Design a protein around this ligand. Structure first.
Ligand code: CLA
Ligand code: CLA
Ligand code: CLA
Ligand code: CLA
Ligand code: CLA
Ligand code: CLA
Ligand code: CLA
Ligand code: CLA
Ligand code: LUT
Ligand code: LUT
Ligand code: SF4
Ligand code: SF4
Lengths: 197, 64, 40, 163, 211, 80
């Protein structure tokens, strides 16, 4: 089931013998032990799934012309109300922090109490109403798509952060500088990304 | 024959000894039931100045 | 002569030749390009 | 500049220290005659002193409020502000020399121990062998990583322990 | 084994075996272990092959410069001539140089570790051409002229390559004490040999004897 | 009132007995060694704790050890 090799000709790693998304990657032998791998495989899918939603968010704000992902929480210091598609949601800052904690604590706690190692990664029933998981072939194939797309969101959400710190420009504006003058507008010409430029 | 061969090198395993995890020539071995028959000789001296000592069968093992 | 060369190969004598070399080299390295502190 | 230190060229105390150290010799030079050897000795010391001060200023050194040159050790600030020859470059010069002494003595020890009576070879050295190794150690870093990557540098639990 | 760098009595220990450009020159004995001798061999090639293609830019062009056909600059100041140009490519060149070489060189690094190890579906469809005959001498890169049985044209590759490695060391040293280009240094040794040398004018030795 | 214990590694050299001045060590037969001898310490009341004996022992580590302890007139070597 090996999707490929990150380094063709590299030595096979037996700890990743048959899993979804295997590329024989691990060079630091993290995951040598069998029990820790089940935890990492759980952490990867959840660090994935949170990134994919958060990534489409930052694009959704800028694509639809609403504003920046960075300036979204700035209403608190100014005092104005937040908005969702300019609807003026009324809740206050202390109300968000209270509902978020109690809601996610109920959710995360129920997740940890599963004690079914396969369902801790890939639940069923209510979390998939339409029933794509019934077909084992497409299920096995769609798992590679969940993981390949997810690793793009994670590495790239980091890019939204790193791009912002060196240059305060937003996402789509920072891209336009590459397309307008690629060789001049790069991370090397930031003056902060590389010491000594 | 009871023990290692004459002239054979062996490694010591007494924790007390100055020669521990070190190699020495087997000078002789006694086959009369003595507790510490194996006589061994090393090049390096100990703190007193003695370069030989009688070791046991279990206390010695093959070289390296 | 074989024993004389062996005496010269002792520790006290070889060290004497080493000392004249290292000290002679350093003193000569201070006499020319006088009193160095920063290396260019 | 950095750390609130002035360059030695622009400092006043640095030039004050030069005018002082020369005044001592000029007073000492008055006693003797012009063409005598004590006069030539002091004039040379005067020539060296004038050369010591201008060379340290030319080298972009940093002098403090006391007027004496200060050294900088971080390679980042040294390279950024052009002060690398002070400390950062002296470190590589010494390590090459220190490693050379180690790689040489380590080889003489190993090779003499492969023969009979190695104790005599320490008190009565094999000078032809010692000179051979001493002129073969110019590329000591290559041999070290060669010996590390190979695994014949370190011994493996064939050493004496105490408990 | 080809002739000896000393004609007389300098017995080599491990170079009697076959290898290219073997003249028995290893005083420091850095090629004792065969595994790393295999590594230093490839280093002599990448330094040899790279140095030669570099020396032409200094040599083939400066000959045309001294004759007067072109007005190009000298290698000691060619770098400061590019970036002040209006249409210039400011220093994203150091990093792109590393991002591009990092892709190729690690493909060469993993070949010496696992020879002929380029998987079937790793590259798009050219996985077969990338396989090499030997380490340092691949197949599909040269289009003609590598089907002879007496393959040691390689000796030309080394004797020409070792020579160029001396050139750039001489270019860099000549251009640090003479202050002029390499060819300008040649026109002087021909016009006044005894006066323009490394001893008297080129300050490589402290010679101050005015009498 | 010192303590003198001899261990299994004795080989019957008798060098411990010849050394200690105060006659606190004697030889006894035994079946463990080639020499068929072993030391003993019957009268440690006369032990001055000089520790010369341990020096005489020529084994890798000492088969005779003098563990110092409570003192006395005989042990302190007091003529008075
Ligand atoms: C290997 C090729 C090579 C060649 C052909 C030259 C040629 C020259 N060098 Mg030069 N040089 C070289 C390497 C070379 N160099 C290297 C590697 C260094 C650094 C150690 C220097 C450092 C140097 C200095 C500092 C100076 C020169 C100068 C000169 C010129 C005058 C001759 C001289 O001073 O003696 C050359 C002195 C040497 C110590 C190098 C000679 C030793 C080489 C390795 C022997 C090679 C054998 C043989 C010549 C090869 C034939 C090749 C030929 C057929 C193409 C002359 C054009 C002088 C100048 O100002 O130019 C006008 C000068 O001041 N060179
Ligand atoms: C593209 C990413 C992706 C993919 C391929 C999958 C794939 C899968 N998930 Mg999964 N999941 C994801 C993201 C993804 N998930 C995220 C982000 C979360 C967190 C909410 C989850 C939470 C989750 C749970 C809790 C469960 C699954 C399950 C499953 C499996 C069955 C359902 C299925 O076939 O999904 C098919 C997926 C699609 C057809 C994609 C739909 C595309 C949507 C509509 C896009 C909407 C966003 C919008 C366009 C973005 C706006 C952009 C902005 C710029 C404006 C399957 C392996 C179940 C399982 O384990 O199976 C047994 C299960 O229990 N997933
Ligand atoms: C999918 C990942 C992804 C993508 C497409 C981008 C894309 C971009 N980044 Mg970005 N970035 C990323 C991840 C990413 N980044 C991460 C993880 C960090 C943190 C280390 C940054 C930190 C960063 C800074 C600090 C800056 C950018 C900038 C930029 C823009 C121009 C310069 C450039 O591309 O070089 C930067 C990109 C890299 C060095 C890529 C490294 C990671 C891998 C190669 C990404 C995978 C790409 C994939 C093969 C296709 C461009 C739109 C610049 C910009 O817009 O402002 C002028 C800028 O200043 N990025
Ligand atoms: C045609 C439009 C165009 C042009 C001319 C450029 C030009 C450039 N991009 Mg770029 N880029 C573009 C569109 C464009 N970009 C778009 C649409 C994206 C998606 C967001 C990116 C994402 C991107 C990233 C993430 C990075 C660049 C980088 C670079 C620079 C170095 C090239 C490189 O990576 O080395 C070539 C190296 C290779 C290994 C070749 C791989 C690609 C093969 C040839 C295809 C170069 C100035 C890099 C940069 O700024 O670093 C200095 C960098 O990290 N670009
Ligand atoms: C004439 C008076 C005289 C003096 C002052 C000395 C002094 C010394 N001898 Mg000696 N020697 C003498 C006569 C003398 N010897 C005679 C008549 C003989 C019979 C041939 C010998 C035979 C002899 C032997 C066989 C040895 C000495 C050694 C030594 C050194 C002791 C080791 C040490 O402590 O450093 C310890 C050194 C280190 C821990 C690391 C080495 C670094 C050292 C210090 C550098 C070398 C120092 C150099 C010799 C100093 C110059 C000589 C000095 C007296 C002016 C010591 C400096 C021992 C020695 O190794 O010499 C160095 C040693 O093995 N000597
Ligand atoms: C950690 C102790 C230490 C260190 C780091 C230094 C370092 C230095 N000393 Mg000092 N010295 C020391 C101890 C030390 N010394 C002691 C204990 C004394 C009293 C005995 C002296 C007495 C002393 C005097 C009298 C002089 C020095 C001088 C020097 C400088 C000259 C370097 C040189 O020779 O030029 C460069 C040499 C080379 C590059 C060749 C060496 C590398 C080989 C050839 C390879 C140098 C930076 C000289 C100086 O100018 O003062 C600043 C000088 O005049 N020292
Ligand atoms: C324990 C050793 C040590 C210490 C305490 C420092 C301390 C410092 N370095 Mg430094 N550095 C070191 C080793 C060290 N360096 C080494 C070994 C290198 C590689 C040659 C560097 C390369 C380096 C660069 C390139 C720079 C610094 C800078 C700095 C300063 C800012 C904080 C910093 O590093 O960024 C925060 C680090 C977080 C991990 C600070 C004075 C910066 C500077 O110049 O400060 C103004 C800077 O640009 N350092
Ligand atoms: C080839 C000889 C040699 C070599 C390779 C080493 C190597 C080493 N020693 Mg060491 N040592 C030596 C001789 C040597 N020593 C001698 C002669 C003495 C007696 C003075 C010591 C006393 C000594 C102590 C107390 C310690 C070390 C320690 C160490 C380790 C750390 C380096 C250090 O700071 O040491 C210290 C360096 C010295 C004390 C200077 C040694 C004197 C000269 C400079 C070296 C002798 C060279 C030899 C005489 C030349 C023979 C060449 C041959 C061809 C003739 C290191 C692996 C340290 C350690 O335990 O590591 C954690 C440590 O605490 N050594
Ligand atoms: C790099 C870069 C940078 C620059 O600046 C810009 C740019 C160029 C743009 C880039 C970026 C990128 C990013 C970050 C992001 C994007 C995308 C992603 C990754 C995600 C989303 C997005 C993703 C996602 C997952 C979302 C969604 C999905 C899903 C499945 C959900 C839900 C579902 C499930 C549960 C299942 C069922 O049955 C059905 C449903 C209900 C339907
Ligand atoms: C010192 C000095 C100084 C003064 O001033 C000057 C002088 C006189 C000059 C001197 C020097 C000399 C030297 C050393 C050198 C030179 C040259 C060389 C060696 C090389 C080039 C040059 C070299 C080279 C190699 C180049 C080229 C070649 C080649 C093959 C390329 C390519 C190819 C290949 C890959 C393969 C394929 O299939 C084909 C082809 C495509 C065809
Ligand atoms: S001195 Fe030691 S080895 Fe000798 S007889 Fe006494 S106990 Fe035995
Ligand atoms: S302590 Fe002294 S007197 Fe007593 S047995 Fe030992 S050597 Fe003899």
């Amino acid at each position: 089931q090996r999707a490929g090799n990150f380094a063709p000709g590299s030595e096979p790693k037996e700890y990743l013998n048959d899993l979804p998304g295997n590329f024989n990657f691990d060079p630091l032998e993290l995951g040598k032990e069998k029990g820790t791998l089940q935890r990492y495989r759980e952490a990867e899918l959840i660090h994935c799934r949170w990134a994919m939603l958060g990534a489409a968010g930052c694009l959704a704000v800028e694509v639809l012309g609403l504003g920046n992902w960075y300036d979204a929480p700035l209403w608190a210091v100014t005092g104005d109300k937040p908005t969702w598609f300019g609807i003026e949601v009324p809740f206050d800052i202390a109300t968000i922090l209270g509902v978020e904690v109690v809601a996610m604590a109920v959710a995360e706690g129920l997740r940890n109490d599963n004690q079914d190692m396969e369902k801790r990664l890939y639940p069923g029933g209510a979390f998939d109403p339409l029933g794509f998981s019934k077909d084992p072939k497409s299920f096995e194939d769609k798992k590679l798509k969940e993981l390949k797309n997810g690793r793009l969101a994670m590495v790239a959400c980091l890019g939204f952060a790193g791009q912002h710190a060196a240059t305060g420009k937003p996402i789509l504006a920072a891209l336009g500088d590459h397309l307008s003058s690629p060789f001049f507008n790069n991370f090397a010409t930031n003056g902060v990304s590389v010491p000594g430029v | 024959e009871i023990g290692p061969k004459r002239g054979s090198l062996v490694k010591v395993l007494r924790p007390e000894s100055y020669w521990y995890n070190q190699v020495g020539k087997v000078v002789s071995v006694d086959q009369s039931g003595i507790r510490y028959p194996v006589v061994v000789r090393f090049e390096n001296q100990n703190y007193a100045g003695v370069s030989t000592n009688n070791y046991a069968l279990d206390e010695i093992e093959e070289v390296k | 002569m074989k024993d004389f060369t062996t005496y010269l190969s002792t520790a006290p004598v070889v060290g004497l030749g080493w000392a004249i070399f290292t000290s002679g080299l350093l003193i000569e390295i201070n006499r020319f390009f006088p009193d160095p502190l920063v290396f260019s | 500049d950095i750390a609130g230190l002035t360059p030695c060229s622009e400092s006043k105390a640095y030039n004050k220290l030069e005018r002082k150290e020369l005044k001592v010799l000029d007073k000492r030079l008055k006693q003797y005659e012009p063409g005598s050897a004590p006069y030539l000795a002091l004039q040379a010391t005067k020539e060296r002193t004038e050369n010591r001060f201008k060379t340290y200023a030319k080298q972009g050194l940093l002098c403090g409020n006391d007027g004496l040159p200060h050294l900088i050790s971080d390679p980042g600030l040294a390279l950024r502000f052009n002060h690398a020859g002070e400390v950062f470059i002296p470190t590589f010069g010494f390590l090459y020399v220190a490693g050379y002494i180690g790689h040489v003595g380590r080889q003489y020890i190993i090779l003499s121990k492969e023969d009979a009576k190695p104790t005599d070879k320490e008190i009565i050295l094999d000078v032809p062998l010692a000179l051979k190794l001493a002129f073969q150690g110019w590329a000591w870093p290559l041999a070290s990583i060669q010996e590390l990557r190979n695994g014949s540098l370190l011994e493996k639990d064939e050493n004496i322990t105490v408990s | 084994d080809r002739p000896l760098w000393y004609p007389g009595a300098t017995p080599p220990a491990h170079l009697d075996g076959s290898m290219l450009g073997d003249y028995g020159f290893d005083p420091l004995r850095l090629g004792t272990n065969p595994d790393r001798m295999k590594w230093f061999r490839e280093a002599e090639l990448t330094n040899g092959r790279w140095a030669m293609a570099a020396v032409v830019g200094i040599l083939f062009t400066d000959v045309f410069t001294s004759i007067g056909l072109v007005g190009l600059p000298k290698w000691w100041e060619a770098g400061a001539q590019t970036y002040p140009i209006d249409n210039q490519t400011l220093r994203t060149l150091a990093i792109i140089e590393f991002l591009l070489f990092g892709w190729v060189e690690t493909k060469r690094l993993y070949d010496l570790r696992n020879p002929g190890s380029q998987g079937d579906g790793s590259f798009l469809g050219i996985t077969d051409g990338l396989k090499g005959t030997e380490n340092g001498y691949p197949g599909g890169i040269f289009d003609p002229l590598g089907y002879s049985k007496t393959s040691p044209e390689k000796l030309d590759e080394l004797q020409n390559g070792r020579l160029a490695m001396l050139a750039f060391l001489g270019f860099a040293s000549t251009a640090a004490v003479n202050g002029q280009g390499p060819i300008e240094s040649l026109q002087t040794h021909l016009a006044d040999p005894f006066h323009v040398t490394f001893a008297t004018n080129g300050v490589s030795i402290p010679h101050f004897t005015e009498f | 009132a010192h303590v003198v214990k001899i261990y299994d590694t004795c080989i019957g050299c008798t060098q411990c007995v010849r050394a200690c001045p105060l006659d606190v060590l004697e030889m006894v037969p035994w079946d463990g060694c080639k020499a068929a001898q072993m030391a003993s310490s019957p009268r440690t009341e006369d032990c001055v704790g000089c520790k010369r004996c341990e020096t005489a022992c020529p084994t890798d580590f000492l088969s005779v050890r003098v563990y110092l302890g409570n003192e006395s007139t005989r042990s302190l070597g007091l003529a008075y």
